[PDB]
Amino acid sequence: ANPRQRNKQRSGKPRLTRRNANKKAKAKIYGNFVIQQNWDKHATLRQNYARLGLLATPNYVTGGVEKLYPDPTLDDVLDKEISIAPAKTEVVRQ
Amino acid sequence: PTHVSKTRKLRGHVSPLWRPTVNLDRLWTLLPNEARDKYLGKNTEVAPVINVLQSGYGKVLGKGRLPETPVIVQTRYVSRRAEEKIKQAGGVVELIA
Amino acid sequence: RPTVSIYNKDGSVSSETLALPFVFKAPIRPDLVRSVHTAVAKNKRQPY
Amino acid sequence: YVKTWFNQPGRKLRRRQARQTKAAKIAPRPVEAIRPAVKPPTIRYNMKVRAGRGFTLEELKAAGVSRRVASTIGIPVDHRRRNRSEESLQRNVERIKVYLAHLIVFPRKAGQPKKG
Amino acid sequence: DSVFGSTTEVAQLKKNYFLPENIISNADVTRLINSDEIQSIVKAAGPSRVKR
Amino acid sequence: RSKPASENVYLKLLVKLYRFLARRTDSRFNKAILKRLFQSKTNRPPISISKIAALTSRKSASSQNKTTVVVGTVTDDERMLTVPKLSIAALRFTKSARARILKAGGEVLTLDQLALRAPTGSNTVLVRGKKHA
Amino acid sequence: MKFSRDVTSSRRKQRKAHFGAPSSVRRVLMSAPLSKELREQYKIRSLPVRRDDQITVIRGSNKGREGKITSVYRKKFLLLIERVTREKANGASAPVGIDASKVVITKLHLDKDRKDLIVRKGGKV
RNA sequence: GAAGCUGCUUUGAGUGUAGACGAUCGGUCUAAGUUCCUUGGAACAGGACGUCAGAGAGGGUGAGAACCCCGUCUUUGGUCGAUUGGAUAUGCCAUAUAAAGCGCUUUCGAAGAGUCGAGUUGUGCAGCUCUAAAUGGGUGGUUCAUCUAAAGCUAAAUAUUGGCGAGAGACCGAUAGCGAACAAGUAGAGUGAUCGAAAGAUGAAAAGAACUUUGAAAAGAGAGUUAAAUAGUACGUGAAAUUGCUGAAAGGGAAGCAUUGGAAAUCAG
RNA sequence: UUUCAAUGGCCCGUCUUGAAACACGGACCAAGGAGUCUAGCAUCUAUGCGAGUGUUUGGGUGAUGAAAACCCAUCCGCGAAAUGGUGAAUGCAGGUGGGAACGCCCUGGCGUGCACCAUCGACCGU
RNA sequence: CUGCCGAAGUUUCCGGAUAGCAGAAACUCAGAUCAGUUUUAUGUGUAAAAUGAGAGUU
RNA sequence: AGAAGCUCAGACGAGUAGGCAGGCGUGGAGGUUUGUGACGAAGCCUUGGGCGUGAGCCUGGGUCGAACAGCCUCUAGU
RNA sequence: AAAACUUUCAGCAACGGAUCUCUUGGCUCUCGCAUCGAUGAAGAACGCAGCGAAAUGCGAUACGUAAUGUGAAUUG
């Protein structure tokens, strides 16, 4: 439409086409090797974090989570020590 | 739609302080149903607590009769007749700052 | 409830059955479905 | 001047990709920091509890974290907020203390010369 | 049964959804009219198309 | 109004059923029911479960086993706590009203079920809703 | 169905690419199937045509005629075959062009380059 | 925060190699009928018999092609090179007489001026005149609360009719859609600033009409090519207005129209 | 269908006026050509739910087109209380009459009496 | 494009609100009320038989 | 018995402003017709025929040469 | 009162370019990306092919040279 755009529409030189428009592709994992091995590329990060035994956010989630199946006072607290947390997943144990 | 418009047929014819209010009759409705089955109609030593502030209400008004079961009403403000009916029903009012 | 027989890969009836879900007893409304479909089949319309 | 929202689905997917790109960079760790719990500043909202910006310097000190390593392990600091009541202090100390118990800290590599 | 629930049981995969209830119980009024209860009380059935 | 603007097939089925009952009987009840089925939603206000409970045991009470009939929705009344035994036939019941009546009370009926039980409207209380809106 | 967002299913863009493709691409556009004996010999479904290739016309008015390739007219997608011509009014011979997809290769013009291409496309030479 | 003290916890602005995980660029790899009959100039049509399918998107090919061709799917990858990113493992080097966090104090703690502000004149900001302070000053609220100006930097979420590309659409279909589907800001107009069109389609293939004859020639007539010249470049289809020819009929200063029939023509049951 | 005969037939649109006539428009044909889209408000109707109601700011999710469909955490909008701070059954959430509808009778009588409307009544509009 | 319903053509108060004529929706009314009408009676006006029509309101 | 339907009887019929209802046609979309089509789709022409009160529809013949329609809904640069 | 002329109807031929069918174009929406110049840019002028006017390409190395990829054309 533009004089610049019509300039290369009538020009014989081919366009500088780069085929980078692949949507639906989720970024692959670098960083941790243990995460990369146990990470599957189809699932979302919230699904991968939950499966691996990790937290995607330490806060509340600002939406309704998915449901795939029908599931079935200072002193005593300021100085208390939380007895760590158990490792439920082999990856978390790893 | 343009098709159902009547101009398709004219073709050819030349053309303050935030304080929501709750009344006494709805005080028991605010409480869930399983607690009402447990506390309403039974003379239990422990009484249910209805914090009407957490349910988005600022003042408790006096419309309605409460059942004779006592209940502790925690609120910010309460009409004078409302807490009259509350102790007549056996309950108490704890004003919340 | 009524039961529906399950069919194997070769079309033979399997001995297992499932009770008919309540959704199959829901009211069948041509008028309501047509109106919902009219509005829902409009939600992937690009502008012009 | 009319603003249109035809790119509303395009924006939603772009952010989900951006979250995915974050997790690619930093995989074993959450894509969000831990925010404190605070009470909104009005008579209309003070009954509720929402997420603040960061944990005050007293909340970090009471929990056992220093204000220098707090950012390293992902704990935001708010130098502006202060603890006017023990209720707010004890609430956010346990928010950190739960965080520290649930946290795995991978060791770094420390350079050490031949002599001391 | 979990996706849609029933008319008295909540859907497990849809929070607070019950199946809709119908206007009528039996959707066949022809047998409703020809039932014994209604036929025994209706007045005398007048003629069909009459002679001019 | 010779027909309703509603395209609901089941409302048309009710209209067909009460077209026959109105003309093949001599019940002023059935003629009234047919007219109210034709009436638009504006002219068919909802009636509360409490007003139904009131109008049954009102003044001399004497509700006995009479079935309440309203051409409209029977909305629940959460203010009233202990629900009496009632038998109501209506176009629609809100999920609360249907659950409350069934749990502590009698039964809910549709307009076709009532036409089978009381084709001539015998022992039926025809109740309307307040139009003051 | 296409699933890539990099391939265009537009008729407008497909005709523009086909009719504006350069000679290096028109070489791959004008391919012909190998014959039965050649296919069972080379395990190759199809090859791009080349001058001095013995083919056999399969479809058209010239069905059954056999000959070599004298010139692949890449700029109009036509193949020219010897002894397949049209006699004009003035007696001159105008060779008749056939689309490459309408012939079948019966004897390849093997070179070093074609041999590597044969074994490149999963074939045995 | 400085300075002292204390005793616990800390540490590389190096330099190679290896392999893994990513990003970018280019090359490369890819399943199944072109079997039979009929129609046709051409089969890609209909029928018969089959095949492939993680491929039945789309386009090309002499008419509707999943199986003739490019592709498509596999690819949310194989392979070959490149160019790179942050980690991991490991080698070498390390100027540590060093640097830091936390904790303790019988020791200290600087904080931005023709700026704030007052007056006045303009539209918080600016001009003019005057011109400060140090628990001072700013801003709020009924003494209190909050903040720390007159110096500076800073990613992400955000915008995007342009620039480099891409994929689409219940959009327009050549008086439409951009002014411009062709030739387009072109031809053309104006001293100049500027203004600014019209114009798409032969056929599958140019096979674009050899040859003969008339004619000064343009062309005509036979001929020839084609499935077709009722496709001849004044080229798909060819409407109406309008014009010529032929046939039929009517007409003494309008005509068209309507009703009922005759005559002539032509249909129907 | 064309034509003839008898009978009839003033040029259409617009404008002005009580009304015409005037006054404009109309050489002919083809194509184009004028109550549209959107924001708000109100009526009516339909639909879903109903003292509730509203998923689509956003998040989750969606391999087959992923701008669709699907799921919903916290808020918020309107409604549920009015009056000018306070803040509602006195009395089956009040009696009388008319009244839809039903029942019992031996047309009419009796009982029950929705909606709505006049009536005495209250409570802080209910 | 066809079909159905169908006016006002002007009072009364300040361009209007009003009324009037035309429709719609929802009510009650048939042992009832109406009427561009005529008689009868009382003194042109008022009141109660003839004839026609189902008549009302919001 | 497409109760949306079937049937009987009577009365009525101009109609501006206005009010109300049912229909005809067009481009594109979802569904559908085991739909039509190079043995000729669409278009166009015709002193050919038929249907409808009407908007219009179907068809014979000729011409033409690649697409098109009926029904149910959606939509509008109708 | 025959022809001409005028008019009407039909046929053929003209003129015209409607209609139909499509279409390497427009328009609209979304998506990814960030890259002009004193190391001479955008724009202008003149040139360059065996046979060329525009467009395209290019700059006296002038419808291009080097390198790389492909592997046998270009075509009036």
From Swiss-Prot, chain D:
Q: Name one GO cellular component term.
A: cytosolic large ribosomal subunit
Q: How does it assemble?
A: Component of the large ribosomal subunit (LSU). Mature yeast ribosomes consist of a small (40S) and a large (60S) subunit. The 40S small subunit contains 1 molecule of ribosomal RNA (18S rRNA) and at least 33 different proteins. The large 60S subunit contains 3 rRNA molecules (25S, 5.8S and 5S rRNA) and at least 46 different proteins.
Swiss-Prot/TrEMBL GO biological process terms? cytoplasmic translation
Q: What does this protein do, in the record's words? A: Component of the ribosome, a large ribonucleoprotein complex responsible for the synthesis of proteins in the cell. The small ribosomal subunit (SSU) binds messenger RNAs (mRNAs) and translates the encoded message by selecting cognate aminoacyl-transfer RNA (tRNA) molecules. The large subunit (LSU) contains the ribosomal catalytic site termed the peptidyl transferase center (PTC), which catalyzes the formation of peptide bonds, thereby polymerizing the amino acids delivered by tRNAs into a polypeptide chain.
**Domain of life from the UniProt record:** Eukaryota
Keyword Transcription in annotation: no
Q: Which cysteines share a disulfide bond?
A: none
Where does it localize?
Cytoplasm
Recorded source organism is Schizosaccharomyces pombe (strain 972 / ATCC 24843) (Fission yeast)
Q: What is this protein identified as?
A: Large ribosomal subunit protein eL13
User: What are the protein's UniProt keywords?
Assistant: Cytoplasm, Phosphoprotein, Ribonucleoprotein, Ribosomal protein
Q: So what family is this one in?
A: Belongs to the eukaryotic ribosomal protein eL13 family.
Full protein segment contained here: 21 to 136 of 208
Supply one GO molecular-function term.
structural constituent of ribosome
UniProtKB/Swiss-Prot annotation, chain E:
> Where, subcellularly, is it found?
Cytoplasm
According to the lineage, what is the superkingdom? Eukaryota
So what family is this one in? Answer: Belongs to the universal ribosomal protein uL4 family.
Task of the protein:
Component of the ribosome, a large ribonucleoprotein complex responsible for the synthesis of proteins in the cell. The small ribosomal subunit (SSU) binds messenger RNAs (mRNAs) and translates the encoded message by selecting cognate aminoacyl-transfer RNA (tRNA) molecules. The large subunit (LSU) contains the ribosomal catalytic site termed the peptidyl transferase center (PTC), which catalyzes the formation of peptide bonds, thereby polymerizing the amino acids delivered by tRNAs into a polypeptide chain.
Q: What other remark does the UniProt record contain for this protein? A: There are 2 genes for uL4 in S.pombe.
Q: Quote the entry's note on domains.
A: The eukaryote-specific C-terminal extension harbors a nuclear import signal and delivers the ACL4-uL4/RPL4 complex to the pre-ribosome, triggering uL4 release from ACL4 and incorporation into the 60S ribosomal subunit.
From the Swiss-Prot or TrEMBL record, give the protein name: Large ribosomal subunit protein uL4B
Gene symbol here is rpl401
Specify first residue, last residue and whole-protein length for the fragment. 261 to 312 of 363
Curated annotation (Swiss-Prot), chain F:
Q: Which GO terms describe its biological process?
A: cytoplasmic translation
Q: Provide the protein name.
A: Large ribosomal subunit protein eL18A
In this chain, where does the modification Phosphothreonine occur? Answer: 73, 75, 120, 124
The record's comment on protein family reads: Belongs to the eukaryotic ribosomal protein eL18 family.
Subunit architecture: Component of the large ribosomal subunit (LSU). Mature yeast ribosomes consist of a small (40S) and a large (60S) subunit. The 40S small subunit contains 1 molecule of ribosomal RNA (18S rRNA) and at least 33 different proteins. The large 60S subunit contains 3 rRNA molecules (25S, 5.8S and 5S rRNA) and at least 46 different proteins. eL18 interacts with NAP1.
Any single GO molecular-function term of the entry would be: structural constituent of ribosome
Organism of origin:
Schizosaccharomyces pombe (strain 972 / ATCC 24843)
Could you tell me the keywords of this UniProt record? Cytoplasm, Phosphoprotein, Ribonucleoprotein, Ribosomal protein
Q: Where in the cell is it found?
A: Cytoplasm
Its function?
A: Component of the ribosome, a large ribonucleoprotein complex responsible for the synthesis of proteins in the cell. The small ribosomal subunit (SSU) binds messenger RNAs (mRNAs) and translates the encoded message by selecting cognate aminoacyl-transfer RNA (tRNA) molecules. The large subunit (LSU) contains the ribosomal catalytic site termed the peptidyl transferase center (PTC), which catalyzes the formation of peptide bonds, thereby polymerizing the amino acids delivered by tRNAs into a polypeptide chain.
Locate the Phosphoserine modifications and list their residues. 2, 50, 122
User: Which part of the entire sequence is included in the shown chain?
Assistant: 15 to 147 of 187
Classify the source by domain of life: Eukaryota
Q: Name one GO cellular component term.
A: preribosome
Q: What else is known?
A: There are 2 genes for eL18 in S.pombe.
From Swiss-Prot, chain G:
GO cellular component terms, A-Z: cytosol; cytosolic large ribosomal subunit; nucleolus; nucleus; preribosome
Subcellular location, principal: cytoplasm
Q: Which family does it belong to?
A: Belongs to the universal ribosomal protein uL24 family.
Q: Describe, as the record does, how this protein assembles with itself and its partners.
A: Component of the large ribosomal subunit (LSU). Mature yeast ribosomes consist of a small (40S) and a large (60S) subunit. The 40S small subunit contains 1 molecule of ribosomal RNA (18S rRNA) and at least 33 different proteins. The large 60S subunit contains 3 rRNA molecules (25S, 5.8S and 5S rRNA) and at least 46 different proteins.
Q: Reply yes or no: does the keyword Iron apply.
A: no
Renumbered residue ranges of the record's region Disordered: 1-23
Q: Which InterPro entries does the protein's record reference?
A: KOW, Rib_uL2_dom2, Ribosomal_uL24_CS, Ribosomal_uL24_euk/arc, Ribosomal_uL24_KOW, Translation_prot_SH3-like_sf
From the UniProt record, give one GO term of the biological process aspect: ribosomal large subunit biogenesis
Give the protein's function. Component of the ribosome, a large ribonucleoprotein complex responsible for the synthesis of proteins in the cell. The small ribosomal subunit (SSU) binds messenger RNAs (mRNAs) and translates the encoded message by selecting cognate aminoacyl-transfer RNA (tRNA) molecules. The large subunit (LSU) contains the ribosomal catalytic site termed the peptidyl transferase center (PTC), which catalyzes the formation of peptide bonds, thereby polymerizing the amino acids delivered by tRNAs into a polypeptide chain.
The record's annotation in Pfam families points to: KOW, Ribosomal_L26
Q: What is the protein name for this chain?
A: Large ribosomal subunit protein uL24
The UniProt keywords, alphabetically, are:
Cytoplasm, Nucleus, Ribonucleoprotein, Ribosomal protein
